[PDB]
Design a protein around this ligand. Sequence first.
Ligand code: HEM
Ligand code: HEM
Ligand code: HEM
Ligand SMILES: COc1c(O)c(C)c(C/C=C(/C)CC/C=C(\C)CC/C=C(\C)CC/C=C(\C)CC/C=C(\C)CCC=C(C)C)c(O)c1OC
Ligand SMILES: COc1c(O)c(C)c(C/C=C(\C)CC/C=C(\C)CC/C=C(\C)CC/C=C(\C)CC/C=C(\C)CCC=C(C)C)c(O)c1OC
Lengths: 352, 352, 431, 55, 55, 126
Amino acid sequence: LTVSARDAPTKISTLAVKVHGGSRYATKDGVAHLLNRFNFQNTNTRSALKLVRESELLGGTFKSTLDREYITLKATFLKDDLPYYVNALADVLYKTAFKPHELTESVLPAARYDYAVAEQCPVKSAEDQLYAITFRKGLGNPLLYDGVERVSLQDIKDFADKVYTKENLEVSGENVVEADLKRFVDESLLSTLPAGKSLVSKSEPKFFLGEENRVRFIGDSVAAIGIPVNKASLAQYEVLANYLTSALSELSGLISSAKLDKFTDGGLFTLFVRDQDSAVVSSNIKKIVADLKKGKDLSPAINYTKLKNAVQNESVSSPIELNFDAVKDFKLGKFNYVAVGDVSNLPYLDEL
Amino acid sequence: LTVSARDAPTKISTLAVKVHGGSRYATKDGVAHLLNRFNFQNTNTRSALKLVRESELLGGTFKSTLDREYITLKATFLKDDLPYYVNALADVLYKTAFKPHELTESVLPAARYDYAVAEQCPVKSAEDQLYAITFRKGLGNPLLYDGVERVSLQDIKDFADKVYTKENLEVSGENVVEADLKRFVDESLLSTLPAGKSLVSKSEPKFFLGEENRVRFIGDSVAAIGIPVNKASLAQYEVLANYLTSALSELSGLISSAKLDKFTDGGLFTLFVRDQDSAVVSSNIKKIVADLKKGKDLSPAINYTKLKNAVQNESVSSPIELNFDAVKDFKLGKFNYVAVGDVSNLPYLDEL
Amino acid sequence: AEVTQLSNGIVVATEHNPSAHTASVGVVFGSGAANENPYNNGVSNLWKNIFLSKENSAVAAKEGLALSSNISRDFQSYIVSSLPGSTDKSLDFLNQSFIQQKANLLSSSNFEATKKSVLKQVQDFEENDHPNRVLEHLHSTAFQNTPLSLPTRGTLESLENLVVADLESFANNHFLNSNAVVVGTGNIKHEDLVNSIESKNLSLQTGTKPVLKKKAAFLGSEVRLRDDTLPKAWISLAVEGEPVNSPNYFVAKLAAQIFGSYNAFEPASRLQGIKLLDNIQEYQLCDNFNHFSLSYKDSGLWGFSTATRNVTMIDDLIHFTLKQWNRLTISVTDTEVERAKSLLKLQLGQLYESGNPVNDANLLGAEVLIKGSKLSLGEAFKKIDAITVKDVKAWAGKRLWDQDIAIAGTGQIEGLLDYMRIRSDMSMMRW
Amino acid sequence: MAFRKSNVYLSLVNSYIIDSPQPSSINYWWNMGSLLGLCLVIQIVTGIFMAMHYS
Amino acid sequence: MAFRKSNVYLSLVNSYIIDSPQPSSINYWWNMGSLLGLCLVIQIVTGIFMAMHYS
Amino acid sequence: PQSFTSIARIGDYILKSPVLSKLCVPVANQFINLAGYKKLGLKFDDLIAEENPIMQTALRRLPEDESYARAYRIIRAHQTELTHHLLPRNEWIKAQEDVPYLLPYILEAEAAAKEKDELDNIEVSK
Ligand code: HEM
Ligand code: HEM
Ligand code: HEM
Ligand SMILES: COc1c(O)c(C)c(C/C=C(/C)CC/C=C(\C)CC/C=C(\C)CC/C=C(\C)CC/C=C(\C)CCC=C(C)C)c(O)c1OC
Ligand SMILES: COc1c(O)c(C)c(C/C=C(\C)CC/C=C(\C)CC/C=C(\C)CC/C=C(\C)CC/C=C(\C)CCC=C(C)C)c(O)c1OC
């Protein structure tokens, strides 16, 4: 039960509760996605309709977001309604109703919409396979629910009993007095939660190199590569991503996107090439791979990547501390590869 | 233009025209499927409606079939109507109309139904995946048309002109006087076809070993393995297929299907395990590959294989003669692997 | 908090924030898309992409600077962002690359490449972005033959004729000291910024901007871009709204908050305290709608935008939404006004009090080019709290009750009725 | 939906004289049908009131 | 489609008399509506033939 | 058109009163036997009129096994009445089987609709 806050003379406040209950801890496929879409339904003391109508007259909103590591409950409100929104979030983690007709009428139709939206994007598909072939059963779990594995109402109740524990969540706030937040976090239903255990494992996950996968798709062709990164080489791949999508590189015109997703135990580097014509996708990916094998000098991009990292970290409260002062060179070694689209006209791994 | 037939005292005759124009010769994905569905449409001298009405009053039927090697046009009729069906088949290969309205009204909707009924069977999805990862381009080409690659009316016209040549087809008949068939073929429109070139190559197809693939699917789970086979080992894997499915093997109750597909230059061995429970599929495939790695004695199955071979070669007019007499033992080496279904609960290749 | 100084013609305004981790400086000009003509439409779009060109932005990356630029109807801005303590280089970059030396940027093979890329940016906007291209045609039809009707991105037909000599004409007429405000947001002090500007020359041109002959005037009209191959229908509908410098600026904004936004696929969006929702939910009439209130120098627009797949019941959607607008004149309740007050204060506090110094620079620079100062967030809250029910009814009876409207649409809009059937819904015969 | 479309009796009125889709090119010769409807009403009403005094 | 369902006039007869879905357990009290329509026809036909001789 | 919340409120007060329970419950048992719906193989909860939104919500949330059984009892009653007979005595519904299976779903749907009406007519003080 960690509580921290930052103060400021402003009008709006923000409260967040982060739970180590993302897709990488799911016991069944998509069970974490389903728990995300049940977070602000009826509780045992207040209805979903009553909460929406009451907070509108006070000036606040609610949201819940899912990724591969976290489930986040967030509230944005006016600075003087702090105690009201502490208890609203405490009741969600404590006494959610979990009714059989809420899943059939509200939760399942909402999950189908999310899955159908992400399925229409070939870049989201290629990123999912890159996570699947690099890490198989850890970070490689599917993010969204698609019905391939059956998940029942008791499964969602069981999953919530495991991740909603006092040792597995942190409380953060922006433009909030920290002494007042600590008082309200106590004398609340958060202090009466079960004291389970932290699900975080410190050891580096198992990864696999040299894999490949192909998916047929109607639309835009996409070629992507992925590289697992350890904890001591996160800064080197942070500079490379910014350099490859900046005016300092000649390959930035051939690259659609490039990023480094950071975890507390490592990361994954992703690079995507997307075009409507499969002849351009095949030609661009070959030039990028050959050029990266020769080697690149990343020293000119160190100052640029220091400012870009500051932009992203302003919103975040617990970013990874990086140095960037010792990044000198880079040479591509082994990587994974995924091709999505008109695969019959896209290259294989042995041809790159 | 090779013509051959066998006579018999029988009231029904059959005539087949085999063209080396299967999916392994297709210039575009599904272009051979669209030409197969375009076969018995309007020609330049006769309509599709007129052909059906006139043939029904004479007692005959038509059919067109597609596989990875051939496109076959078949006519079953009463014995005395032979000269009518020689010209009818010759007109299809010579003067098909290829009207733009016939593609949107009859040919495209028919191809959509064939694709819809094959995407629901996990065994057919797994077999196509095994062909793709073993041979990449050629025998690994997709069988049916799904619209991933745009195929136009001019592409179907161009493909037909390439495959419908005098040197690329063989004519055979059952319960047909051979002397009479040659005279009718000689004075038909078949003799005026272009003399192109044979599309069959005399070399061996390049293959790959140790590959893997996983596909998510809602329904039954399937696990499969695939072994490329050269010309000298064709008889050894024919005994292995019949030994595993028959009652001579303890593994027969765990194997859903097993077969060897034979070509002129080689073949492919396939084995399938399918069940609605993922745990059953996982345990069965592990036990199968561990038993085959130790070895088998395929001697007690030679006589059984000889009978089964003669059963399926009864209809085929050009069966390659295999020996089966010098088959002693088997030992599993390297193979390809595909998993379809609940892939988050199925084994990986390195665990087999 | 906002501090504004004057210096020989240019205006310096800052919004200091010590907790920020990034400072931002730039220049905002008080001329935009409403200052062009139907033959040079798209000049301000070319100047934006020339500033963000590959060669210009490569020089900025070496020092560790990032560039941004925005084009609107009234203002355009050019911003340089950097870490605190690097503000001296950002001012230097702006001086010698955009203010005093435009010849290297306007070279051949750099103008010809930028023009190639922008011609592609507007080709796919015109055939892929449907909701944002009917809101642009709404401006085109409601302000036709007046400066407030030209699209901000330009026109494809108009952009094929622009040459390099047209870009120098526009720069000479508008990039002037009397039309510019120098802004600084984030972690940067007012004293430091003004001292740096005077330590250098940092002077724009001397002339004054040309004045426009005719002002913007609203006209009730409609334009129909029917396309039966698209799967949806997109419709925008509005009346004449309020200018920026008006006493009814916050009353019109609060009126749009009463009806708000809607998402059919969000469980929490279906529980909002809006009386319109119970009419459009029994039969699914739309997928989403939003109510806006756009203000400019001369006029404004007030209305809503919709997208629906229920193409056979478009008339029901329009009939029910306009009948709820009528209640703003006759029977709006006290609970509806109190709820809209709370949601407007939250929405304003999320736009001016975000964490992006680039967003703040555009907002602060545009409000000074119009009224010479910036109204604080504390004072605006006092003005919103003072609104009463009698204020809403007076404003709605003047702007909404039995007034002319503007309509734009595309997609499957056969079920959208004629102008006179829709205009009849702006009043009730029972009252 | 609107009450004019959901009601059993109003929906027959709406479908015939309110929301009926008409071509935009029909001239004044297409006005004689509505006139014949007014003629029939005139003849019935005057005949009934005259029939109260007729033998 | 059958002619009794595609025709403009026969569709009304079919939807009210021929193919109307009825509950299977309605007793003989549900036969009074059809009797009331026979009474109305009897009154109108006899009244018109008597009106040819009335002053 | 009396709400089931009103019926339950009045009914409970009778059952928790020892004096009223001994004088009213015996009358109600004889009232039910004389009604005679059990002789057609029906429970009381099958007789509630369903052409309103409240009862259409409750019938939607009923589990499948209960929903299939209810459809059989209703069809059987229509055919038995068609013949002007009763069911054989061993097929009659017993008293211990006549349980209010649909009542909890009706009360839950009624409480939600009442809270929606009290929030649409809300008035904020101060
Ligand atoms: C009391 C007698 C009649 C009434 C009330 C009546 C009513 C109508 C009405 C309202 C229309 C549509 C409006 C219009 O077209 O002007 C119409 C159309 C029509 N009527 Fe009549 N009508 C009558 C007699 C007749 C007669 C005697 C004929 C032919 C011998 C006829 C044939 C037609 C035709 C063919 C149309 C459609 C024409 C078109 O739309 O192009 N009607 N009628
Ligand atoms: C389409 C409807 C009708 C038509 C075309 C029609 C036509 C006529 C005509 C041409 C006359 C001769 C009048 C004269 O020459 O002075 C007449 C007379 C008369 N009609 Fe009609 N009629 C109609 C409807 C009715 C109805 C419905 C009634 C009674 C309910 C009625 C009652 C009479 C009477 C009482 C007379 C007596 C003669 C007179 O009053 O002039 N009519 N009718
Ligand atoms: C000439 C006068 C009438 C005629 C021709 C007529 C005709 C009919 C017919 C054919 C039916 C359906 C079949 C049936 O239930 O028997 C019906 C049902 C009905 N009628 Fe009438 N009716 C007349 C008068 C009335 C009156 C005066 C009332 C009430 C004051 C009434 C109320 C009803 C009701 C409530 C039903 C539906 C009953 C049910 O189906 O459970 N009708 N009528
Ligand atoms: C413009 O749109 C229209 C349109 O609006 C109309 C009406 C029509 C006409 C359509 C029709 C079907 C005609 C409608 C009329 C009839 C079918 C016949 C009319 C019937 C009558 C007039 C009978 C009414 C009679 C009386 C009320 C008797 C009067 C006697 C009284 C009141 C006695 C006094 C009472 C006492 C107690 C002493 C159109 O064709 C048309 O174009 C599409
Ligand atoms: C669908 O369920 C129903 C049902 O709903 C109803 C109402 C009935 C009962 C009744 C009907 C269907 C009929 C309804 C009655 C009317 C609409 C009354 C209308 C009046 C008539 C049909 C009679 C009209 C008669 C004449 C005009 C004849 C007058 C005589 C003449 C012209 C002879 C003079 C000739 C010369 C040459 C001088 C059913 O039987 C029935 O089950 C099938």
